[PDB]
Every structure is written in C-alpha cells, then in structure tokens.
Ligand binder design. Structure first.
Ligand SMILES: Nc1nc2c(ncn2[C@@H]2O[C@H](COP(=O)(O)OP(=O)(O)O)[C@@H](O)[C@H]2O)c(=O)[nH]1
Ligand SMILES: Nc1nc2c(ncn2[C@@H]2O[C@H](COP(=O)(O)OP(=O)(O)O)[C@@H](O)[C@H]2O)c(=O)[nH]1
Ligand code: NA
Lengths: 178, 179
C-alpha cells in the first residue's frame, strides 16, 4: 500500500483544501501520513514552508476560536476524539467574507483542512477529550495571541451552527463576545 | 509563554536526543509545540529536512518494531495514551551496538526522541489505545518495509525489558522472532 492524498478545494470557501490521507488498517490499528513536502508543498507559495507542529489537548465542550493571523497557513486535524472544526472566511475583501464551513473530524473522517492566512480557525470538542494536530507555515517569528485577530465563536454576522450555546471558553474567547 | 525545548543527549546511546517541550495549561487543557525548524533542525545534518509526518493508532498490547533504515532520522512521541518507546543501537560500528534505552511517553512525560539512521525504532502500547506521532527527515524517497531492517522485538542479543511475553505483532515482526 502506497501513501495517497485525496485533495479537493472547498465548494464554499476559495483557497481552503480538504486533504484525505489513505490508511493501512490491520489487527494492530492504523498507519497514515498527515503530510509530506512532496504532495502538500504546492498548497503554499514558494519560499513558505511548514516548519512548526502543535498538539492541543482539550476536554469535552471546549471551543477554541475564532483565531487568525495575517501570515500563517495552517493544516489542521484531530488525531484522537472528535472536533467540529470550523473555518471562517476573515478576508475582508473576499466575496464570502464571514461565510464558514464545518468539518467534523474523527476516527471515521480523518481529514486535514488547509487554511490560507486571514482565515478564522476554530474547533469544538464533541468527544470526552480530543487531540488537535496542526502544522503551521509562515516566514519569520511565530504569531502568538498578541499578533492574532479574534472573532466571537457566536458572532451574529457569521452564524456558525455549534452543537451548544454554552461552551468552555478562555478569557480571550469571552472578551471577543462583548 | 514563549515556545521552549529542553534538549538532552542520551547517557546510553550517542546521537539519541531527548526533547522536552513546555506546555501552556488552562481551564481547557494544554497547548504544546512538538517541533520548529528554528529550534530542532540543528539535530539533523545540514541539508536533511523533516518533511514527513506520520501517525500510528495502536490497540493495547500492540508492539511495532524493531525497524530502521540507513538514511531516515526520526523524531518520535506519543500524543494520546502511553507507549514504551524503545530505541536500539543497530549501528554495527558503534561500541553500544545492540544496547537499548526505554522512554515511557505520555501527556505526563511528553518526551520526543531523535533517532539518527541505522537505529532500531520500537514502541509497545501499555494504554487502552495510543496515537504515536513521528517526523521523518531523509534525502530522496521514503524507505518502505522492503528498504528496512527489522530486529526481533525479543532478540536475546538486545534483551529489552518488555512488559509482556505475547504482544500483538505484524507478520514481519513475527517473522523476525523465528528468522
Ligand atoms: N497508507 C499508508 N500506508 C502505510 C504508511 N506507512 C506504512 N504503510 C503500509 O503499512 C504496511 C506496514 O508497514 P510497516 O512499515 O511494516 O509498519 P509498522 O510495523 O507499523 O512499522 C505496509 O504495507 C506499508 O506500505 C503510510 O504512511 N500510509
Ligand atoms: N508553551 C507554549 N505555549 C503556547 C504555545 N502556543 C500558544 N501558547 C500560549 O498559550 C496561550 C493561549 O494561546 P492562544 O493562541 O490564545 O491559544 P488557543 O486559544 O488555543 O488558540 C498564550 O499564553 C500563548 O502564549 C506553545 O506552542 N507552547
Ligand atoms: Na519483562
């Protein structure tokens, strides 16, 4: 069995890609490739490389977002449990500014979503716990919270269908709701 | 909170590094960085880039190994559950050829292990289930199972301390024990 990626662009959000890796399944579990440069480099303009891997461990009913920055391409997935992954178009000059798309990523939908910069990254944890993996590609220093923009998870102008009105939020994600 | 790494070289096997990231902890859980080019690329010779990310989900009692190849640098960890990660020195020219070191890796002990080429990689799943993450750095094409070596998980010459006599194995990891 060889390493394969099914790739298609979102039908809702221009420049968002849905990457589906194949998996080797046996008695022991599964092996899969989330990323090679060879297959997924072309999703990102010349010079810009994926150079940064993060794991985010969250409990049930946690919502992180909506976070973006001006320079970071993100490849996001859930490698344990289940997240309602939601991308918002936060490009103010996009014909789909503040449109959104949900990807419910779990054991039975192992997708990686590619966000270009100026997009809203968010996830809600619908499992008991979830491990969120994401690769970042940017030039220069990491955009930490102070260099990032924030929209409210429940911003009326976005209207994301979340499975709860009452998520567990950081102070940053609460401040965005005022 | 700045992204940070504690980097230490094994006391047992020259060229094996133990990487410990810091974690942001809050009401929601934890955020941590497993890898940046800026901090970890200097572990690998100039030229060779980490360019391949893999995930292995395994049941309790699964043992995968001992697998290596002549060109692949690996950065390995467990991002859910718990594994006995065992590194073996399989460099026939090293004075610790067939010496081994164990790391029991979990959220509570988040070590990433850097393996140079010609080293034996293995892990056993001690938890209900485990997600094993590993970055590969290599020149050119992936070394698949035909381009790999395999040492028997229980090879007498290594004598690894495993928490079981009867792990769940692949055909090739079973062959190793009889061949
Ligand atoms: N789809 C996919 N299959 C893989 C990958 N890596 C290995 N395989 C397949 O899984 C099978 C077992 O590979 P092996 O290297 O023996 O696995 P291990 O025993 O878990 O280290 C072989 O057919 C491989 O071709 C991967 O990243 N993606
Ligand atoms: N140690 C460490 N801290 C981080 C990392 N990423 C973010 N942080 C810190 O965690 C906190 C929350 O960051 P934020 O981007 O709002 O996280 P989010 O709400 O999960 O998207 C801030 O204090 C960051 O500095 C990391 O990779 N390692
Ligand atoms: Na034993």
């Amino acid at each position: 069995m060889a390493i394969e990626f099914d790739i298609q662009e979102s039908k809702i959000l221009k420049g968002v890609y849905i990457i589906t890796p194949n998996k080797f399944r046996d008695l022991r579990g599964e092996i899969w490739t989330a990323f090679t440069d060879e297959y997924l480099s072309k999703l990102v303009p010349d010079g810009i490389k994926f150079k940064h891997d993060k794991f985010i461990n969250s409990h049930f009913n946690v919502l992180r977002g909506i976070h973006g920055d001006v320079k970071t391409y993100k490849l996001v997935t859930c490698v344990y449990g289940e997240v309602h992954q939601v991308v918002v178009d936060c490009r103010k000059d996009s014909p789909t500014y503040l449109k959104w798309e949900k990807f419910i990523i779990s054991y039975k939908n192992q997708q990686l979503i590619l966000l270009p910069p100026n997009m809203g990254n968010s996830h809600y944890v619908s499992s008991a716990a979830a491990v969120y993996y994401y690769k970042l590609a940017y030039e220069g220093e990491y955009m930490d919270a102070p260099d990032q923009f924030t929209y409210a998870w429940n911003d009326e102008r976005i209207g994301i269908d979340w499975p709860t009105n009452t998520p567990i939020l950081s102070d940053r994600d609460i401040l965005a709701t005022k």
